[PDB]
């Protein structure tokens, strides 16, 4: 029943006694459910080190991954270009999933097409889909550019992308001049970050490969910035701001900031801002190329060094204090622009907050996950804060990366209790947070179920989730945040100490029990 002036949704409606009674009758009558004693015994078992040992012995099963597939990344890269439509050659179920996945993180429209390859294309290939697909898309959604990637069906069946697109133009489905960069993005290789790298290098080749003859390095006096897979609007914006604050000329290559943040003023804008075509054509003329997330930009790096002849500096992601410093100094070395007083003051303000909050942060233990550049940045910043990065997990990481994070760990006394794990999933992480309990997890929304698991063992075993990464679905507008630079560092610092302080308030809220430590001032 409902009381019309206090309507209940599913929670708490189904805690009503008649619903409770009905659900116990369904269970006992027809579900043939394991006894609650057994369920309890097994759950306890899944918290033990005996269970953990078995867990890490998996070779074939994956459970609760912390990665997605290549084409997701190519779509995100494609959306960063002006009036560009992402176009995934292959099966349409993929594109429904990529759109809804990004929809739910950004709470924005995500425009992307497929060419709907079905069983007929499984048999006869997907060239007809490409010809009609290109023409329908250009005519219907009037992009200035269509950026093609692939689903795994189109890779397995061997569709020659370059030939299909060439035949589309020769037979007049689309104009010969119309830009259609493409990249193979097999979802059974690498992860969503790899697809972004593959997509970007495909677009860079389309606009620079056959025109290098007139290019002079440094002619335009800019620095190109490639951001990689980036789902924080504040990170596109902080880099641009800091470069403009220095008077540094720059070209941000793949910039979806406008199209992922349109105003609701009465009109839907399918496209907005983004990198221009002429910016890619002119990119080899830049002084140099800075790669914001180099551990998933290796294919792009080989091409910019190989073909544009840029001396890409080895910078880590500009996260935390030391690496933001190095980023601005290398930018100053390249550009000739001094580091202006405003940025040195902002830096001092970060340091001021570090001194302010260090007592609450010191020795606090964290489990975290994410993509490789993000994870190592986070580890580096936790060390600078004097925290301990106990369980470092990167499902889409590789051994070269692990070597780099381990030596970052070895350089600080706060990394003595840290282990890096690559190729492990969030069911692995679950065991670790039961057997070697940290204070908190830093991670994406899938972390909420690990938290729920740890609370079930008991309030004293619960590991609270601090949501930083991708995707974040169960909180609103955190994609507007910043993780890079001093601005990102200050946001991360603030979130961490306030998560610690919120937890302590909760643990000391108990009157005449723990509230002696329920201090007004912290």
């Amino acid at each position: 029943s409902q009381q019309v002036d206090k309507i209940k949704a599913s929670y708490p409606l189904f805690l009503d006694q008649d619903y409770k009674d009905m659900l116990a009758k369904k269970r006992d009558g027809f579900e043939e459910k394991y006894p609650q004693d057994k369920i309890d015994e097994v759950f306890q078992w899944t918290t033990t080190k005996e269970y953990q040992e078995l867990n890490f012995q998996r070779e074939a099963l994956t459970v609760n991954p912390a990665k997605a597939c290549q084409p997701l990344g190519a779509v995100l890269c494609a959306l960063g270009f002006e009036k560009t439509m992402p176009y995934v050659h292959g099966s349409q179920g993929c594109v429904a999933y990529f759109r809804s996945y990004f929809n739910r993180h950004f709470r924005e429209p995500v425009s992307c097409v497929s060419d709907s390859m079905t069983e007929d294309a499984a048999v006869f290939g997907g060239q007809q889909n490409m010809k009609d697909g290109l023409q329908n898309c250009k005519a219907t959604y009037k992009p200035d550019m269509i950026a093609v990637s692939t689903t795994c069906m189109a890779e397995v069946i061997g569709d020659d992308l370059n030939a299909f697109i060439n035949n589309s133009k020769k037979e007049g489905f689309i104009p010969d001049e119309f830009p259609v960069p493409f990249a193979h993005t097999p979802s059974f290789v690498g992860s969503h970050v790899t697809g972004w790298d593959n997509m970007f290098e495909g677009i860079a080749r389309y606009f620079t490969l056959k025109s290098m003859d007139d290019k002079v390095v440094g002619s335009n006096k800019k620095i190109n910035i490639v951001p990689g897979f980036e789902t924080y609007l504040g990170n596109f914006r902080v880099i641009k701001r800091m470069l403009s604050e220095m008077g540094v000329g720059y070209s941000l290559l793949s910039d979806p900031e406008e199209v992922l943040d349109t105003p609701a003023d009465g009109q839907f804008r399918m496209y907005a801002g983004g990198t221009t075509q002429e910016e890619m054509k002119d990119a080899p003329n830049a002084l140099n190329t800075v790669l914001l997330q180099p551990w998933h930009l290796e294919k792009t790096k080989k091409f910019v060094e190989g073909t544009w002849k840029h001396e890409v500096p080895k910078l880590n992601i500009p996260m935390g204090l030391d690496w933001t410093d190095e980023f601005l100094m290398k930018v100053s070395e390249i550009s000739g622009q001094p580091i202006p007083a405003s940025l040195t003051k902002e830096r001092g303000r970060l340091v001021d907050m570090m001194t302010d909050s260090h007592t609450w942060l010191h020795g606090k233990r964290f489990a975290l996950w994410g993509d490789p550049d993000f994870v190592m940045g986070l580890v580096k910043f936790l060390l600078e804060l004097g925290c301990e990065p106990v369980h470092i997990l990167c499902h889409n990481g590789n051994k070269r990366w692990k070597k780099a994070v381990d030596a970052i760990l070895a350089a600080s006394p706060y990394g003595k209790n840290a282990t890096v794990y690559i190729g492990k999933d969030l069911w692995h992480l679950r065991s670790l947070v039961f057997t070697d309990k940290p204070d908190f997890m830093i991670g994406n929304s899938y972390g909420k179920f690990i938290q729920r698991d740890t609370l079930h063992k008991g309030k004293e075993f619960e590991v609270p989730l601090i949501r930083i990464g991708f995707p974040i679905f169960d909180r609103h507008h955190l994609h507007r945040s910043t993780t890079l630079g001093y601005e990102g560092a200050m946001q991360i610092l603030t979130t961490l100490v306030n998560s610690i302080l919120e937890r302590l308030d909760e643990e000391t809220r108990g009157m005449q029990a723990t509230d002696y430590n329920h201090d007004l001032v912290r």
Binding site: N103, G266, F449
Partner: protein, 476 residues
Amino acid sequence: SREEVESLIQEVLEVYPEKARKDRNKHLAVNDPAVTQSKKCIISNKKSQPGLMTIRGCAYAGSKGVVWGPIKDMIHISHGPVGCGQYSRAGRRNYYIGTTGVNAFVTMNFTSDFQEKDIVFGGDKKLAKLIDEVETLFPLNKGISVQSECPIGLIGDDIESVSKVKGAELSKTIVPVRCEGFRGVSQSLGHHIANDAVRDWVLGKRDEDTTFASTPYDVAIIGDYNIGGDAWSSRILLEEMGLRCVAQWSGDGSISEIELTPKVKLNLVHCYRSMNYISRHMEEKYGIPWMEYNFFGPTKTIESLRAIAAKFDESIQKKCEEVIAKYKPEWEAVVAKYRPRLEGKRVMLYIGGLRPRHVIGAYEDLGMEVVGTGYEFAHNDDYDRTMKEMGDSTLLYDDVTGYEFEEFVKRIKPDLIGSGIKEKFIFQKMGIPFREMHSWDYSGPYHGFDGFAIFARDMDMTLNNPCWKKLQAPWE
């Protein structure tokens, strides 16, 4: 007007290349309730035109996402590369009661995470090892399904042989499902493929176990995936009416209650599109009749209870009038609060295979008007049922393209749009109230009497929200 809508269709179609325009015209139509066969007005369940931004998903979404995934005490493997299982992890709110990771597994993502070497050489060996590992680390699982993603049938893997060999070697139910996303044209063939897999690997397990005793009032809820608790606020009315709901297919669904379903007296079909296949099979194999019902809103829910109860004796019919009487002041109180605030508003819907027609009565119970509706993957028999439900000279669209739906909306100027997560943020920026009519926008239940109150409160809070007055800056 009718000819006004016909000219809207043709002006929208002007943008297309020849091949696409000729095809999209078959899939657009002005309603005419007097027409006896819908295929004479609107064509459906055909391939999507390439590059037009269909809203459809794939056969794996129809099988893993929709039919199998909600079965709570089984472990469902997403078999192939990592994408499909990750995007569909916990995206659909098929609610269940269980201890997750121990005896229930709905929100977890199990996958074989195909790498290149598995594509080149095949994943049958990986699947068999994966199955052993599953048995070790989740011993309380009551069976396993293998949900094939695109590569499996392309690289020639034989998951059926793996399931039979492993199933006999482990004395376990293991279900191989060929719902690869290149099969069919939509979610719809995944439903069919999923029903056939229940039929072939689960449903007959107790054909000779006479241990369960049926009663004249035994029923199963067929085709309710318990979104936001929908199937629970449905079940409660049925059992208040004196029936025994032996099984829920598949929201909050156990494998045992699926196996017990051949024992029931009558199969009650909510979602016709996704479950008519297995309902027809149980009629031919077991003699169990089936009937469609509708639990959206008071008018349909009352109709449905009465037509259901007429299938049983005077004692069930008496209880049905008693249930109707108990909830009469509640939904009247709902209608009294909310109908004035919604009277006269025009809705445009675009959903999957059932609700585009099934929720019309609910809107009309608030004085609202559905001026257009359409379906991602419906069939002719769905549009046959839809033309009788929709008013005359309203707009119908099958597998609408992104461009078509935006243009239709710009001209019809509905007061509210009820569609999917990929549609939501487009129309909000245009200043038109939007309600998710898959996910219920993280609210619900909407089925039944208790679900009607929430559905009414939700349509009011969004259609009448102060934010929609604010999108124009006062300086223009």
